[PDB]
Design a binder for this molecule. Sequence first.
Ligand SMILES: CC(=O)N[C@@H]1[C@H]2O[C@]3(O[C@@H]4[C@@H](NC(C)=O)[C@@H](O)O[C@H](CO)[C@H]4O[C@@]4(O[C@@H]2[C@@H](CO)O[C@H]1O)O[C@@H](C)[C@@H](O)[C@@H](O)[C@@H]4O)O[C@H](CO)[C@H](O)[C@H](O)[C@H]3O
Ligand SMILES: CC(=O)N[C@@H]1[C@@H](O[C@@H]2O[C@H](CO)[C@H](O)[C@H](O)[C@H]2O)[C@H](O[C@@H]2O[C@@H](C)[C@@H](O)[C@@H](O)[C@@H]2O)[C@@H](CO)O[C@@H]1O
Ligand SMILES: CC(=O)N[C@@H]1[C@@H](O[C@@H]2O[C@H](CO)[C@H](O)[C@H](O)[C@H]2O)[C@H](O[C@@H]2O[C@@H](C)[C@@H](O)[C@@H](O)[C@@H]2O)[C@@H](CO)O[C@H]1O
Ligand SMILES: CC(=O)N[C@@H]1[C@@H](O[C@@H]2O[C@H](CO)[C@H](O)[C@H](O)[C@H]2O)[C@H](O[C@@H]2O[C@@H](C)[C@@H](O)[C@@H](O)[C@@H]2O)[C@@H](CO)O[C@H]1O
Ligand SMILES: [Ca+2]
Ligand SMILES: [Ca+2]
Ligand SMILES: [Ca+2]
Ligand SMILES: [Ca+2]
Ligand SMILES: [Ca+2]
Ligand SMILES: [Ca+2]
Ligand SMILES: [Ca+2]
Ligand SMILES: [Ca+2]
Lengths: 114, 114, 114, 114
Amino acid sequence: ATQGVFTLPANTRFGVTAFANSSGTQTVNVLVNNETAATFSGQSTNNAVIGTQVLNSGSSGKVQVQVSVNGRPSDLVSAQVILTNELNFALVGSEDGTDNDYNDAVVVINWPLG
Amino acid sequence: ATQGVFTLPANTRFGVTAFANSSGTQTVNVLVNNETAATFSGQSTNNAVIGTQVLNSGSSGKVQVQVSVNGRPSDLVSAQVILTNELNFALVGSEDGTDNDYNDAVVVINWPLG
Amino acid sequence: ATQGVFTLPANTRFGVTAFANSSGTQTVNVLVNNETAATFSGQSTNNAVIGTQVLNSGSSGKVQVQVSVNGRPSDLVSAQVILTNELNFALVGSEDGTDNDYNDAVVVINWPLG
Amino acid sequence: ATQGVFTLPANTRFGVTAFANSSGTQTVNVLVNNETAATFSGQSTNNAVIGTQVLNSGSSGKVQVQVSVNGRPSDLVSAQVILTNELNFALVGSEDGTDNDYNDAVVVINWPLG
Ligand SMILES: CC(=O)N[C@@H]1[C@H]2O[C@]3(O[C@@H]4[C@@H](NC(C)=O)[C@@H](O)O[C@H](CO)[C@H]4O[C@@]4(O[C@@H]2[C@@H](CO)O[C@H]1O)O[C@@H](C)[C@@H](O)[C@@H](O)[C@@H]4O)O[C@H](CO)[C@H](O)[C@H](O)[C@H]3O
Ligand SMILES: CC(=O)N[C@@H]1[C@@H](O[C@@H]2O[C@H](CO)[C@H](O)[C@H](O)[C@H]2O)[C@H](O[C@@H]2O[C@@H](C)[C@@H](O)[C@@H](O)[C@@H]2O)[C@@H](CO)O[C@@H]1O
Ligand SMILES: CC(=O)N[C@@H]1[C@@H](O[C@@H]2O[C@H](CO)[C@H](O)[C@H](O)[C@H]2O)[C@H](O[C@@H]2O[C@@H](C)[C@@H](O)[C@@H](O)[C@@H]2O)[C@@H](CO)O[C@H]1O
Ligand SMILES: CC(=O)N[C@@H]1[C@@H](O[C@@H]2O[C@H](CO)[C@H](O)[C@H](O)[C@H]2O)[C@H](O[C@@H]2O[C@@H](C)[C@@H](O)[C@@H](O)[C@@H]2O)[C@@H](CO)O[C@H]1O
Ligand SMILES: [Ca+2]
Ligand SMILES: [Ca+2]
Ligand SMILES: [Ca+2]
Ligand SMILES: [Ca+2]
Ligand SMILES: [Ca+2]
Ligand SMILES: [Ca+2]
Ligand SMILES: [Ca+2]
Ligand SMILES: [Ca+2]
């Protein structure tokens, strides 16, 4: 199934934050209405916050997360969870190797903000 | 029901990160086996990271998040989500006021690292 | 924080299914726009499906689960999770006693159908 | 990433329930210590419960859900969620066609029981 794609409410500010846990340099791209709105990169095996940014979901609400390492796309897993019918998290893990820890880049999207 | 309390695998490193979305200054405490292991403070209405750290779950694996604003305890909501039977997120939202957006301090715990 | 209340897309068919794990008779009421639309009762310590139904979320999309044991409300816990940005689960657990297993009545809501 | 595989606590009872939403007949197999422990089959486009059982998670606690329709393996999506650090849901969706609704068979695993 497709992973790393979330439909947010339209024209809504959200946070996006990326953590690294791999010997490979991670590149995280965040697309809004199918175009790149943000790019984060770094290399850590201790969960460094390689990027964090506030974006707007735009008229479609479509947000997509992609991850690559040395130009090779990582395998993604994802889901969304809502607490008390109000607080949203869209969660992404990624695997760039063979050990299947799926933490090589971890991305958290959250809304509402403010 | 209790919220903000999680049982991690014993002797396991995990990341804990907090964001703020309120006019009030957020105080986030993270307790491991009932001892304070991290404290974050800050203010933002734009999802700023007010703290991030790597901790160890110790012999008990018990992790608890508490949030307060100028001495007043915030009401908490929480859940844990596991992706591909491997990647763990423990998620906390908090309310410091009347609007019940539950984003005033937002805490994300993730493991495994490395 | 409020639990057992979910906003569905308007005018959408959803499944609702209740399970029992207690010596006490569980009464599960499912409200749509604040009026009872389905009621199930039963006693089981083996996860019996004490009822299942298809309902329509109506114009408001407001769906609420209530659980009691002979008129005494149970303590509820809940969350919503979305898989591949399509498949929705609204989840409820409840506690009717002192052991805090929170499984005494369990309710699963799922959409879309068909 | 692998989907429909969950590590439960060992030697622990869990409930498994399957729903159908497709013109294709769904067959769901539930495997415990890598052997089929339950098989459910049925056809519904209205969320009919096509089977439910209580099983023991065995030595490893590894539980696997597999879904097929007319002999063809369906594409799976899954996640686990834990409420108040106690109540566990393992959730499976599946796709047997081209519309990506992932509800064609829906499987819910829950524990603890009793
Ligand atoms: C009128 C006022 O300053 N109210 C704040 C409220 O911010 C407002 O923010 C709340 C604040 N209200 C005012 C008028 O200053 C006051 O009621 O305290 C709240 C916290 O108990 C404020 O909320 C937070 O809400 C604060 C609140 C914090 O306890 O303190 C009041 O005195 O901060 C705001 C910015 C939001 O993030 C809230 O979710 C958060 O709880 O809240 C309004 C929303 O209800 C609205 O955002 C106003 O613009 C804001 O001033
Ligand atoms: C031999 C080699 O170069 N392996 C890298 C692999 O890194 C190794 O991963 C191991 C654990 O699976 C150990 O940590 C080794 O010390 C390490 O060299 C690398 O894997 C990534 O980086 C490591 C540190 C972990 O975070 C992995 O989860 C992560 O996938 C991969 C990247 O594709 O390449 C080789 O296989
Ligand atoms: C002695 C008695 O009748 N107690 C009732 C509870 O049943 C016992 O619960 C304990 C755990 O607290 C244990 O399971 C015993 O075997 C039960 O007899 C009863 O608890 C409810 O039913 C249980 C079977 C269990 O599912 C529990 O989680 C659930 O809350 C409570 C509430 O109905 O009432 C007591 O009188
Ligand atoms: C023409 C036909 O019968 N096609 C079968 C699919 O049913 C149609 O699915 C489409 C969506 O792709 C749409 O709902 C049509 O009205 C159906 O007739 C069938 O899809 C499965 O059953 C559907 C009713 C729906 O639940 C869908 O999500 C599900 O995948 C597939 C099953 O492999 O077979 C087609 O031949
Ligand atoms: Ca890896
Ligand atoms: Ca890694
Ligand atoms: Ca607030
Ligand atoms: Ca706020
Ligand atoms: Ca109980
Ligand atoms: Ca019980
Ligand atoms: Ca389908
Ligand atoms: Ca379908």
